[PDB]
Amino acid sequence: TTGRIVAVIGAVVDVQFDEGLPPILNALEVQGRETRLVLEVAQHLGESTVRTIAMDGTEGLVRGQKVLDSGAPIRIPVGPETLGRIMNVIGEPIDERGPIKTKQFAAIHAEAPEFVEMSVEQEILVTGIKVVDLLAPYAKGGKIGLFGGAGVGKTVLIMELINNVAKAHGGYSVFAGVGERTREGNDLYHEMIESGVINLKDATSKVALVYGQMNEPPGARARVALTGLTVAEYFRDQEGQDVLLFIDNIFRFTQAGSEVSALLGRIPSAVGYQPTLATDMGTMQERITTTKKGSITSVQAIYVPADDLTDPAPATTFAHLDATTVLSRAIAELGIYPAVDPLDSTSRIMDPNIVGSEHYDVARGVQKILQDYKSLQDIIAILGMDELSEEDKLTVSRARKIQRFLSQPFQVAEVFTGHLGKLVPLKETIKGFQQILAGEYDHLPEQAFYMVGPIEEAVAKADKLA
Amino acid sequence: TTGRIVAVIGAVVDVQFDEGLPPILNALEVQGRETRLVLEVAQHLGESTVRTIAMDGTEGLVRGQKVLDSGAPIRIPVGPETLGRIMNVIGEPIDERGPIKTKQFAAIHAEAPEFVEMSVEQEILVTGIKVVDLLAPYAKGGKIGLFGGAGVGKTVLIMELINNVAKAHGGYSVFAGVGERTREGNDLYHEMIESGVINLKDATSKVALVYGQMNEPPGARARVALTGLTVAEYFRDQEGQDVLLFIDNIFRFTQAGSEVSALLGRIPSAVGYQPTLATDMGTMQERITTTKKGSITSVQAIYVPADDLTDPAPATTFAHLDATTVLSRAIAELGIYPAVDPLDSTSRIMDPNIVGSEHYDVARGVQKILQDYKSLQDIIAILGMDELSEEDKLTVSRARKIQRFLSQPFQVAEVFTGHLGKLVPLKETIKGFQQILAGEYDHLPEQAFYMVGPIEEAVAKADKLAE
Amino acid sequence: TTGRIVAVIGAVVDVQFDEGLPPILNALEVQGRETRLVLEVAQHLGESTVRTIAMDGTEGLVRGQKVLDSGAPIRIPVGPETLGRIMNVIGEPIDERGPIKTKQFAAIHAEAPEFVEMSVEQEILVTGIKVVDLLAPYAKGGKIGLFGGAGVGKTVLIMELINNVAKAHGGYSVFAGVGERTREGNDLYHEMIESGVINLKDATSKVALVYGQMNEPPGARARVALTGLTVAEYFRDQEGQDVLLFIDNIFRFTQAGSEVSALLGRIPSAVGYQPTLATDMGTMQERITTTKKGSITSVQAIYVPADDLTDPAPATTFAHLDATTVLSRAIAELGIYPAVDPLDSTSRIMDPNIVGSEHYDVARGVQKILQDYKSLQDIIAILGMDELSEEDKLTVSRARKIQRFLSQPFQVAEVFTGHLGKLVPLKETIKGFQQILAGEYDHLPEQAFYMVGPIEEAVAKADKLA
Amino acid sequence: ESTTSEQSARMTAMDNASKNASEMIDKLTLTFNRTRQAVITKELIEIISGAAAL
Amino acid sequence: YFRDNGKHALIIYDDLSKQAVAYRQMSLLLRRPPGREAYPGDVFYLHSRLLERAAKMNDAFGGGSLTALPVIETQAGDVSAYIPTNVISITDGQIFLETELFYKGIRPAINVGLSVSRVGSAAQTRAM
Amino acid sequence: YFRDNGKHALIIYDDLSKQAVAYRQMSLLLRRPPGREAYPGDVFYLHSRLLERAAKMNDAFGGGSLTALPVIETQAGDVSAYIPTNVISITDGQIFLETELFYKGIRPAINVGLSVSRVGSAAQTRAM
Amino acid sequence: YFRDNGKHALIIYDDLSKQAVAYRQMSLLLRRPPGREAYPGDVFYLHSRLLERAAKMNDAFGGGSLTALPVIETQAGDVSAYIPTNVISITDGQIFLETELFYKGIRPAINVGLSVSRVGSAAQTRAM
Numbered sequence A, C: 001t002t003g004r005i006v007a008v009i010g011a012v013v014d015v016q017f018d019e020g021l022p023p024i025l026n027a028l029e030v031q032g033r034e035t036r037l038v039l040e041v042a043q044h045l046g047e048s049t050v051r052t053i054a055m056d057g058t059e060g061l062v063r064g065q066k067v068l069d070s071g072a073p074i075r076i077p078v079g080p081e082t083l084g085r086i087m088n089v090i091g092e093p094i095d096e097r098g099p100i101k102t103k104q105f106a107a108i109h110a111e112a113p114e115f116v117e118m119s120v121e122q123e124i125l126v127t128g129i130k131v132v133d134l135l136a137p138y139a140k141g142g143k144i145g146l147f148g149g150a151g152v153g154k155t156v157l158i159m160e161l162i163n164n165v166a167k168a169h170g171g172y173s174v175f176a177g178v179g180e181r182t183r184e185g186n187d188l189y190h191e192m193i194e195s196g197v198i199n200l201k202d203a204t205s206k207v208a209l210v211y212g213q214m215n216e217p218p219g220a221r222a223r224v225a226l227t228g229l230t231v232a233e234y235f236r237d238q239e240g241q242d243v244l245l246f247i248d249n250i251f252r253f254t255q256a257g258s259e260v261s262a263l264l265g266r267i268p269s270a271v272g273y274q275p276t277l278a279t280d281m282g283t284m285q286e287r288i289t290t291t292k293k294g295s296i297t298s299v300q301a302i303y304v305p306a307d308d309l310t311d312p313a314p315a316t317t318f319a320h321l322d323a324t325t326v327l328s329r330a331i332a333e334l335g336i337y338p339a340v341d342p343l344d345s346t347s348r349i350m351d352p353n354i355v356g357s358e359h360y361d362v363a364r365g366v367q368k369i370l371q372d373y374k375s376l377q378d379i380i381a382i383l384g385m386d387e388l389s390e391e392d393k394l395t396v397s398r399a400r401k402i403q404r405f406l407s408q409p410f411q412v413a414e415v416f417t418g419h420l421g422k423l424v425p426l427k428e429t430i431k432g433f434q435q436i437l438a439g440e441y442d443h444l445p446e447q448a449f450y451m452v453g454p455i456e457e458a459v460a461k462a463d464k465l466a
Numbered sequence B: 001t002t003g004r005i006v007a008v009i010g011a012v013v014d015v016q017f018d019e020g021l022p023p024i025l026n027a028l029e030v031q032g033r034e035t036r037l038v039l040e041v042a043q044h045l046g047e048s049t050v051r052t053i054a055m056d057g058t059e060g061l062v063r064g065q066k067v068l069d070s071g072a073p074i075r076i077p078v079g080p081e082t083l084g085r086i087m088n089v090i091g092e093p094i095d096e097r098g099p100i101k102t103k104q105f106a107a108i109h110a111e112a113p114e115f116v117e118m119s120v121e122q123e124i125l126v127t128g129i130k131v132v133d134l135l136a137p138y139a140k141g142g143k144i145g146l147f148g149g150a151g152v153g154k155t156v157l158i159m160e161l162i163n164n165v166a167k168a169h170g171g172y173s174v175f176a177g178v179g180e181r182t183r184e185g186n187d188l189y190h191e192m193i194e195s196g197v198i199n200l201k202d203a204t205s206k207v208a209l210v211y212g213q214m215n216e217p218p219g220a221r222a223r224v225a226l227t228g229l230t231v232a233e234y235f236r237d238q239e240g241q242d243v244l245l246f247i248d249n250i251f252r253f254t255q256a257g258s259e260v261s262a263l264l265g266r267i268p269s270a271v272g273y274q275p276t277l278a279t280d281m282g283t284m285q286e287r288i289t290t291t292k293k294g295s296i297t298s299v300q301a302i303y304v305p306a307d308d309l310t311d312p313a314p315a316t317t318f319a320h321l322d323a324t325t326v327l328s329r330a331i332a333e334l335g336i337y338p339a340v341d342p343l344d345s346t347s348r349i350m351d352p353n354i355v356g357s358e359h360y361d362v363a364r365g366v367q368k369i370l371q372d373y374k375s376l377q378d379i380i381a382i383l384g385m386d387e388l389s390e391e392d393k394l395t396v397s398r399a400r401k402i403q404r405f406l407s408q409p410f411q412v413a414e415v416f417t418g419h420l421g422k423l424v425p426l427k428e429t430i431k432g433f434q435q436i437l438a439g440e441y442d443h444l445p446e447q448a449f450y451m452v453g454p455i456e457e458a459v460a461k462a463d464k465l466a467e
Numbered sequence D: 001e002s003t004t005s006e007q008s009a010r011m012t013a014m015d016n017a018s019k020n021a022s023e024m025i026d027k028l029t030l031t032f033n034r035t036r037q038a039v040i041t042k043e044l045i046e047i048i049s050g051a052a053a054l
Numbered sequence E, F, G: 001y002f003r004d005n006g007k008h009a010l011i012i013y014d015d016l017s018k019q020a021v022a023y024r025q026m027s028l029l030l031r032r033p034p035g036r037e038a039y040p041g042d043v044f045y046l047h048s049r050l051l052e053r054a055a056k057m058n059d060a061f062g063g064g065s066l067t068a069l070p071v072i073e074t075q076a077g078d079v080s081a082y083i084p085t086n087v088i089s090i091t092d093g094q095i096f097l098e099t100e101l102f103y104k105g106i107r108p109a110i111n112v113g114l115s116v117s118r119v120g121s122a123a124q125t126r127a128m
C-alpha cells in the first residue's frame, strides 16, 4: 500500500501509512521522481508514522507526496554479472553500459555469520612490503586496516596492495569507494581497463566496482559499504572461493551516520558522534569476514580525524582488525614511505608458532632498538647526539639505518617518484634486518639504506657514494 | 497517609498522594516487600506528586504499589547501644546480632551548630607519622582530610591512624563506611574484635560502625554519611565525652548525589556535577565539628577523580578542613609511602606560636630544600649535574635524603612493605630532619634513609649496607 | 502602540502587543519608572510576543507593566553639540551638563555603506607622528589595533591623535569606552579637559565621548560601540569629514555579545563565544570605511585572552585590522616616547603601490638597519665594540640615531613636559630618516635626534653649546 | 690546540641546544593554546548536552 | 554609609569565587541558560555592579571613600579561568600569589613581577 | 553459583571499556541525560556493583569464592583518566601495562610503581 | 555553465574558512550537535560536495573544465586542525604559504617542500 510524506529535513523523511506499516529496514520508493529515490525505514515513531533515511537528494519533495513500500530491504544485483561493472548504493549501473542482468538479487542488510561459522586457520599473506611482512604481517582471509591522517598515504598503499595481491589473485575482487574522490574512481576504472582486470568486450573481468563518493548525501554514503560487502558475500559463499574486498574509506561510513544522527533525534555522544557509533560499526564489520564456507581478505582504509587516533571513530575500529598498519605524519615528513609507524602497527599473526622463531626474533629485535632510540630522542632534542654515551650512539646509528631500510619505493608511485618500484621476498626481508642488527653494516652510511629493495641494493648504493 | 507509585526510573521514584502530602525529607515505607524499602522525599512535583530517592534497590516495584508516610525523616538508633554494633543507612543492624535496644532515636537530617557554638582552642595531636607530625600536624578536635587519587594510600593511612590514636583513645569512636569496599568493612570489623576495640561478649565496645558500600544504590550512599555523623553527634552532645569520627570516603556522598541529579531534573553544572554540590556539602560538613558542648576529632578520606585536585568535589572540600594531608601518585609510584606530598599538605596549627619556632623552622626548612630540588630537577635532567656548584649539589643530595626520611614503615602495612611497622616520637622527628638539614649525615648513602623510623635506624641501616 | 510585560528573567524581558509588533532591533520604552528603561527587541517568539534585551536594571518590573514601541531602533543625538559631552548607549547625557541640544537624532543600527558607495582608493591618514607615518601608516577608513595596556602612554597617544587629526584634517574624534571602569572614565574626562581636546567653555571641543560602564548589563555594553559609531557617522556623512573613532576595548565588545548570546539561550561556539561572533563583529566594523563623502578611521585597543593570538576573539578582530600600533614597556624604559615598537608595529599599506616607492624604500631601510643593529647585539656584548667592521660600526651609529629620531614630543603633553609638541609633515619625516640612512649626519651626536620634530631640529639641538 | 677545539665546540653545541630549546618553546606554547581552547569547548559541549536532554 | 558620610571604609570579599558558585546554583535551578563552566551570562554583571560601588568621592560629596579587596581562588594557577578573568578585568589591579613562591620561603607569596596597581605611584607617600 | 556452593570460580570481563560504551548507548537512547564524558552520571555504580559480587565467603557460608579480573583499555597510556580511575577505585589492585616496556622486551609489560595489590602477602604462600 | 559548454572556468573560494564559520553559526542556531571545534558533523560534506563540482570533462561531454582554488586560513601554521585536514582530503594537492618565509622576504612565501600537485604535474608543458 501507499504512505505519504509528513515531514522532510535533509536526508531524514517521515512517512505516514494509513494501512500496513513497513518494518524497520524496508526500502520505500518515492513517487513523482525523475530518478529512483529510495527511503530506508529507520524507526516506527508511533501514530502510524515511520522515520526513514533517503538514499539520494530530497530537494523537490513535497508534504503529501506518495511513497510505496517495496516489501523488503534494499536489494541489489549479485553474481558474475557485477564483474567489470560499476554500481551505486542501490544496485543501479553508473557506467552507462546498460542493465546488470543477474539471476540473483540480495538485500544489503543481513545478520553477521554465527559463532559456529567462524574459522580459526591462520596463514600468512606476504605482500612484498618490508615493514608489513616483518613487523605486522597480513593473513590470508584476515581483516587488514590502514589508518592515516590527511594525505599521509592511505590510498597509495591500498593501490599498491591491489597491484601486489589482487592482480596475482585467482578469484574475484570487490572495490568499494565510500565517501572519497570521484575522479579517483575515474582513474581506478581506467587503470583497471588498461591492465585488463576489467574488460568491456569479454567476460574476463575480475573486479566488481561499487561507488558512493563524497558528492553523495549522507544516507547513500552511510550505506554504500553495505552494498559493496554484499557483493563480496555472494562470491564468498555462493561460489565457495577466495575473495578480496578493498574499501576506501570505511571512516566515511561513521561520518555519514553522524550527519543523519544529528537529525534522527538522538542525544549526542562524545565529540558529537551518534550514540550508536560502536553498534552501527559492529553490525557492519562483523559481515566483513571469512567463514568456514569461504574466505574474504579485506583491506580497509581508515581516516583519522585531526590525526587523533583516540578519536572515537578510529579508536573503535581497532577491535575489528587482524592486522593494523598505522600511517604516521611525522614519518612521511621524514621522507620515509610507506609512512608506517613500526611500533604502533600490529598483527595477531606475529607469533613464533606461526611465522617461525627466526622471523619472530628479528621483528622483536627491530622493535626493541626502535623503542630504545625513541626513549633517547628526548635527550637528543636539546643537546643532540654528540652528548650520548659511546654506546647509545651505537643504538642510535643502527636504529636510524633500520628506520630507512623499512622504507621502500612503490611500483604504483613510479609515475611521480621516478624510481622503479620494488618487491622484496620475505626471506630477503628477515635477513637484511638480521644483518643490520648484528652490526654487519655499521660501516655503511645511513643514506645507503633509504628507499631501496633488498639489502644488496643498500651496499651497492653505499658504493655509488664516491 | 497512603500513596501510590506512579513512576520508577532507577533509584528515583515518583509517588502520588490523594490526601496528605509528605514534606521534603520525610521517610516513606513501601508496602509489599520482603525487606524494608524506604523512600526519601526530595521534591514536590505538583499535582499531589512527590519525587523520591530509594534507600535500597527498586527492582520488583510496580506502578500502583502502595506507599506509607512515616510522618518524619529517617530516624535511627543513637546511644551506647550502638557501640560494637554495625548499622546500615536506616539504622537497622547488619551484624546479625538482633535489635539495637536504644532508648532514643534521632533524625539523620539536622541543623548545623550555630556560630556561637564554635570553639577556637587548638592543640597538637601527635600521630607518630613523621611527615604529618612534622609538616602539617593534626589538632585535637580539629577537621582532618586525607586527599588521594585512586589507590594512593588514603585507607592505609586512616587504618594506621585508628591504630595509633583510637586504640589509646579513652572516649568513643564512630567509623562510617561510605561507598567503599565491603571487603574492607569485614576486614576492619574482625580487626577491631581482635584488638578488643569491639567486644561481642561484654559491653566494653568503644566504637560504633555504620556502613553503606559501593554495592548499594545511590540513595543509600547519599545518606549513610548522615547516618554515621548522626551517631557521632549524640556522643558529642548527649554525653560530651571526646569523640573520634572516621569517614571512608566522604567523596562518595557527592558522587551519589550526582548519580541521580539528572533524574531529579537538574541541569548539570561543570564537570557533570549537580548544581547544588557546594550547598549540599555545606549543610552536611557543618555538622562535623567540635562545639562548646563537646569535641569531635574528624578524619575524612577524600577521593580525587582522575587524580585532579581541581575537580569540583575535592576542590570544594578544602574549605571545610583544619589540616589537609595530600597524597600523590607521582610519589607512591617511587616506593615512597606514605605517599604524602610535602609541598601540598597543610595545617592551621603550623605556626611558631603554637608548635614552637624549632618545630616551625625545621618543617619550613624541609619545605624549602624540597621545592628547590623540584625546581632544579628538570634542568639537571638535561644539562647534567656537573654544572651545579658543590653547595648546589649538596642540597640535591640532602633533598633526596630528606625525601627518603619522610617514608615510613606502617604497622598496619606489614603485609605490603615486608617491614616491621614503626612509630616515631615528635621530638625524634624534628631532631632527625634538623640534623640532615645541618649536614650531619652527608656521608651516609641515600638508601639508609629509606623506609625507617628514627634517624638511628638510618645510621644502622647504613652500617648494614656497608658490609 | 503599547504592549505589556509578560516575563522578567534578569536582563531578558518578554513583551506582548495585541496589535502590530515592533520589528526586531526596535527600542521599547518601559512606562512607570524613575529613570528611562529601554528594551531592544531581539526575537519574535510568536503569539504576538517579543523577546527583548534590557539596557538597564530590571528590578521592580511587574507583569502587566506598560511598554511603548518608539517605532525604531535606539536613537541618539548626533551633531556638533555632542563634542565635549559624555553620552551613554541611549544617548542620554551622563556628564550632568544638561540636555544635548542637537538638531538631529540617528538610529544606532544601520547597514554598512553599499558596494558602489565604497571608495576604491587607498590613502594614508597622516598623523604627524613619525614612528607611525613612516613605518606603519594608518590608512583612511582602516582599522588599527592598539596593543599594550596601561603604563605605556596610551591615553596620551589617543589625545594627540585627536588633536593632530583636527589640525591636519579638520576631522573630529569619538571615544567609545566599551566596558569603561567608572574610575578611569572620570580620569579620562579630566585628562582631556586638562589637555584641551575638550573645552567646557566654548564649542571648540574636538571629541565626543560615549560610555558603556562595566556595571551596566550586557546589552548596553554590547551596543555602546554602535552608539559611538553612529555619532561619528554623522561627521563623515553630513559634514564630509575624516573622523577618528576610538574603541576601548574591542575585546569587551565581544564579551558583551557573548553574554547577550548566552542569555538568549543560544548554544555557544568554540571556546565559549557566541555563534554569531563573526557577524556581530562584521555588521559593526564594516560601517567603518572610506565612502565617497568622507571617512571613519578607527583605533581599537585589543586585549588578548591568555596571550593567545589564535583565540577566537583576537583572531576574528585581525580580519579587519589594516595596521597595528604596539606600545611597550621595554621601549618606554629606553625613554623613547611614544613607546611604539618599530619592528612589532606594522601596516598593510606599507607597499610601494600605495604609499609610493620613496616612502616604501626609506621605511624598509629603517627596518633593516634596526634589524641589523639587533643582530649585532651579540657580537658587541661578548667580544667588544672595538672589533666590528667599519660597515658594522657605522650601522650601529646610524641605527641608534634612527631609533632616537623616532622619538617625538607631543603637544598634548606640553603641560607636563614644558616642551612644545611637534606635528611632523609626512614628506619631512620620509626625508629626515633618508638623510640619516644616507649618512648625511654621521658627524653628529645621538642625543641630537632624541625628542625633536623635523630633521632641522636635530642639526640645531646639536649646536647648543658644544 | 685542545682548548681552541673545546671552546669552539662548546660554543657550537650551546648554539644548537639554545636554538632547539627556543623551537621547543615555540611548539609547546602553540600546543598549550590548542589544548586550552579544546578543554573549554569540550567542557562546554558537555554542559549543553546534559542541559538539552532534559 | 561611611563612604557617603565623609569617612573611609575598607571592604573585603572573601571570596567572590564562592559567591559566583551560589549564584550559579540558583541560575541553573531556575533553568537559565548555562554558559562557560555552566555560569549564567550575567555572572560578570554580578561582580561588576558590586565592585563599581567602591569609589573615591569629591569634596562636594563629603570626600569619603570605600576601598575594595575582592578575593578570587584560582585552580592550579589558571588566571584565565572564567570567574578569575572577569574579576581581573573589573579591578584596578591585582596581587597574585603563588604556591611555588610560598614553599620556597617567599612569604607573603606575592609575585612582584605580575602583580600590579594601575593607581600605583599616586597612592603612596613621598617617603615610599 | 560456585561461590555459594562451597567452590571457587575465576571471572574475566574482557572488557569493561566496551561494556561502558554500550551502557552509554542504551542509557542515552532511553533519554537519560548524559554526564561526564557523555557517559551516564552513574558509570562508577555500573562497575562497582558488579565487582563487589566477587568475594570470599566464610565457612558458615560454605567458604567458597569468586575471583574477578576485569579489563580496562586505556588511551595513550593514561591510567589517570576518568573511566580508568573509577574502576581502579573499585578493585583490590591493578596490573598496569605500557607499550614502551612491551617493546623494550619487558614482558609481561608491567609497570611496578603504578601497579598494586590491596591484599598483599596475605595472598601469598610463606615461601613466596 | 562554462564547464558544461566546452569552455573552461577558474573558481577561487576566498575563503572557505569563513564560509565554514558562517555555516557553523547557522548550525548552532538550529541547535545541531556541535563536534570538534564546535563544527557540525557535516562540515566535511559542506566542502566535499562543493569541490567535487570542479572537474575535467571528456570530449564526449564537450571537453570543458572547472578548476578550483579553495583558500583556507590556518592559525599559527596548524595544518592538522579540523577544517584544513578536511580540505586536504578533498582537494588534489596544496600550496602551503609560510609566515617565516614571508617575514623573511621569500615572496611568494611558498614552502616547496610541503606543497604538492601530482595531477597538475602530469598536465605541465614539456618546455617547463
Ligand SMILES: Nc1ncnc2c1ncn2[C@@H]1O[C@H](COP(=O)(O)OP(=O)(O)O)[C@@H](O)[C@H]1O
Binding pocket: A148, A149, A150, A151, A152, A153, A154, A155, A156, A157, A337, A338, A339, A410, A413, A417, G089, G116, G118
Ligand atoms: N608510498 C608513497 N611513496 C611516495 N609518496 C607517497 C606515498 N604514499 C603517499 N605519498 C605522498 O602523499 C600523497 C598523498 O597520498 P594519498 O594516498 O593520496 O593520501 P591519503 O592518505 O589521504 O589517502 C601522495 O600524492 C604522495 O605525494
Ligand SMILES: Nc1ncnc2c1ncn2[C@@H]1O[C@H](COP(=O)(O)OP(=O)(O)O)[C@@H](O)[C@H]1O
Binding pocket: B148, B149, B150, B151, B152, B153, B154, B155, B156, B157, B337, B338, B339, B410, B413, B416, B417, F089, F116, F117, F118, F119, F120
Ligand atoms: N603506607 C603504605 N605502605 C606500603 N604500601 C602502601 C601504603 N599505603 C598504600 N600502600 C599500597 O597501596 C595500596 C592502595 O592503598 P589504599 O590505602 O588502599 O588506597 P586508596 O587511597 O585508594 O584508599 C595498598 O593496598 C598497598 O598495596
Ligand SMILES: *N(C(=O)NC1CCCCC1)C1CCCCC1
Binding pocket: B155, B156, B159, B160, B163, B187, B191, B195, B411, B412, B413
Ligand atoms: N589493616 C589494619 O588496620 N588492621 C590490623 C593491622 C594490624 C594490627 C591490627 C589491625 C589495614 C586495613 C586496610 C588495608 C591495609 C591493612
Ligand SMILES: [Mg+2]
Binding pocket: A154, A155, A156
Ligand atoms: Mg586518499
Ligand SMILES: [Mg+2]
Binding pocket: B154, B155, B180, B248
Ligand atoms: Mg580506600
